């Protein structure tokens, strides 16, 4: 009660009245720490920093993040932050004190599940899991389902790959019965989801593919659907080629054509090709599937598209074996197997916090030194999270301890551009994009190398691209932009290793960018009006500064989507600076994505926006991304 240790006492001592069970909401561990250090901890909190969140930003904390006692809010926002700092840092009080300040000052934040659970008795701080279907058998299928149920119990998303499950009509031993396929098994996972979100990963040569991409269709002929599951395609290059050559494409059942999902690139093309020649599947025209994809995406925004070969060929985890899927948001690309469930350890840097208006009037700069610095901090945090996390299933524990993948991201890209008066499609924006990501990658790699010196390289380092001094941009065959000194980094890496197999994967930010008052991660603004009803504060400030914020605006703006193009009284520079995402060529979007990608270890959630969507425009948009070498060609398609 207005004092951190007292708040901790309360949450710690809490008893569920309606039942008589003591229900501690702090772990023993963090309780004792707060107690053994109450003074330092109590007097470090700056309560002034609570009115630094917007109305609707602070009300997202209150609505859902601040711990509550009897439906009444138990935590002030700084208590939350301080709680998280400790949950992350344990006995490391100086580290915790640093994390507290930087979060409270809004330099970065941590994913929702960290915010919810850090400090509490079963601290599941990890943002999502990637699950391998354990085996094409009732035992295998029910063992997986159990595992998802256990996982889906402490919430957090699941990315499930099912390339190895046989398709409708496939043969089954000891019975006259024929297999029913994927759809009815999807249905089982649907029902388990609803009982306790899901992405499903499939390679497009799977014989149940036509039905699988229609998982989210509206005209639901009862039994063949399955909703709040999201289908994602794990596309090999061969598919895209057949589609552009207008050639054939063969559907197989994994039992007649085994191994397809356990090789990529040329080994996959030989194995695939050899299976076509051997008459093991059913050939159709590549474009019949292509057309069904596009049709499904136009109506439902799914399936997502993640390029299998790009992902595997350019992954520092390639020494592990072949990577069979991404995650629910299409940013994580990490190895998974029957006994290794990959985990997403996520945090995001607040890009705008590094803008500085220096000795002058209107000059702004970007403090890349502070950026590098903070990303070193967040790298250290995400390591602790790996160690201090609660693992809902053993598979997850094995995966994280063994390869230690980390997942850094960003938010307030669009804000940064705007504050610095840079159109999203300016050459300056193009350049800032590159430098921002160069410095984050460089920082996290540097910090991760330091850790390898103290605690050793992750178990699985020897034999990896990084161990051979092949870093991410090398696998893109590009020279780094050169703001940072990569030689020295790479030399140290080869000497000492790094602690983390992977480190970058800019994700969706949803409610954690809301609290901080910034825009969805790295996409631009969808509108200059969200909803109540509030206008883009930068656009707002400029319309006041010109006096034109007369009612011929607040009204206009809402009945125009929040667009400013073709307003009669607004300078062209403002027009260029406040384009809606519907007004930015998806071509620029993809280019900037391709630019930043040589600095992304993993992938990123690349939402795509089309105005007057034709099947042809979509097709060019997929191929464009494809040929740019992107791992994630598309997360959702938003349209109309």
């Amino acid at each position: 009660t207005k004092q951190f240790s007292k708040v901790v006492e309360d949450l710690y001592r809490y008893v569920n009245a309606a039942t008589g069970k003591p229900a501690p909401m702090i772990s023993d561990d963090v309780y004792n720490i707060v107690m053994e250090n109450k003074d330092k901890l109590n007097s470090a909190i700056v309560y002034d920093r609570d009115f630094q969140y917007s109305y609707f930003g602070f009300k997202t904390l209150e609505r859902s993040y601040l711990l509550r006692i009897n439906g009444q809010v138990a935590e002030r926002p700084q208590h939350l932050i301080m709680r998280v700092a400790l949950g992350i840092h344990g006995r490391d009080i100086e580290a915790a004190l640093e994390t507290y300040n930087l979060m409270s000052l809004k330099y970065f934040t941590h994913a929702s599940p960290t915010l919810f659970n850090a400090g509490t008795p079963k601290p599941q701080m990890s943002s999502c899991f990637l699950v391998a279907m354990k085996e094409d058998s009732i035992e295998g299928i029910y063992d997986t389902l159990k595992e998802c149920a256990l996982i889906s119990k402490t919430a957090g998303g699941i990315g499930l790959h099912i390339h190895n499950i046989r398709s409708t009509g496939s043969y089954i031993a000891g019975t006259n019965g024929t297999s029913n396929g994927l759809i009815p098994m999807i249905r089982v996972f649907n029902n388990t989801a609803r009982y306790v979100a899901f992405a499903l990963y499939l390679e497009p040569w799977h014989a149940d593919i036509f039905d699988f991409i229609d998982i989210r269709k509206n005209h639901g002929k009862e039994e063949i659907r399955a909703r709040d599951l999201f289908p994602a395609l794990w596309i090999p290059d061969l598919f895209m080629k057949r589609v552009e050559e207008n050639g054939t494409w063969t559907l197989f059942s994994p039992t007649s054509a085994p191994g397809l999902s356990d090789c990529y690139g040329d080994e996959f093309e030989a194995l695939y090709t050899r299976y076509e020649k051997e008459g093991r599947g059913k050939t159709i025209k590549a474009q019949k599937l292509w057309y069904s994809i596009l049709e499904a995406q136009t109506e439902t925004g799914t399936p997502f598209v993640v390029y299998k070969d790009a992902c595997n060929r350019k992954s520092n985890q390639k020494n592990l074996g072949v990577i069979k899927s991404s995650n629910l948001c299409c940013e994580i690309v990490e190895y998974s197997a029957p006994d290794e469930t990959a985990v997403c350890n996520l945090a995001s840097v607040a890009l705008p916090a590094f803008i500085e208006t220096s000795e002058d009037g209107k000059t702004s700069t970007y403090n890349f030194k502070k950026l590098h610095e903070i990303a070193k901090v967040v790298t250290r945090n995400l390591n602790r999270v790996i160690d201090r996390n609660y693992y809902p299933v053993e598979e997850a524990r094995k995966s994280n301890m063994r390869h230690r993948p980390i997942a850094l991201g960003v938010q307030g890209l669009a804000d940064t551009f705007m504050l610095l008066r840079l159109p999203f499609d300016s050459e300056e924006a193009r350049l800032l994009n590159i430098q921002i990501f160069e410095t984050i990658y460089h920082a996290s790699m540097e910090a991760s190398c330091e850790l390898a010196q103290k605690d050793g390289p992750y178990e699985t380092f020897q034999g990896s691209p990084a161990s051979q001094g092949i870093l991410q941009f090398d696998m893109w065959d590009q020279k780094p932009y050169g703001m940072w000194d990569w030689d020295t980094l790479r030399k140290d890496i080869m000497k000492h290793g790094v602690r983390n197999s992977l480190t970058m994967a800019p994700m969706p930010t949803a409610s954690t960018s809301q609290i901080l008052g910034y825009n969805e991660c790295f996409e631009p603004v969808t509108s200059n009006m969200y909803s109540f009803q509030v206008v883009n504060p930068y656009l707002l400030r400029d319309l006041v500064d010109l006096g034109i914020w007369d009612e011929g605006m607040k009204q206009y703006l809402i009945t125009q989507n929040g667009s400013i193009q073709g307003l009669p009284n607004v300078p062209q520079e403002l027009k260029d600076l406040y384009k809606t995402v519907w007004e930015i060529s998806q071509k620029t979007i993809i280019n900037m994505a391709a630019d930043r990608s040589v600095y992304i270890d993993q992938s990123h959630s690349l939402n795509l926006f089309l105005r007057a969507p034709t099947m042809g425009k979509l097709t060019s948009m997929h191929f464009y991304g494809w040929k740019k070498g992107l791992k994630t060609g598309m997360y959702y398609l938003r349209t109309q």
């Binding site: 060529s585 998806q586 042809g616 425009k617 097709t619 060019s620």
Partner: peptide, 6 residues
């Protein structure tokens, strides 16, 4: 099929 105006 291939409209490059996106």
């Amino acid at each position: 099929n291939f409209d490059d105006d996106f």
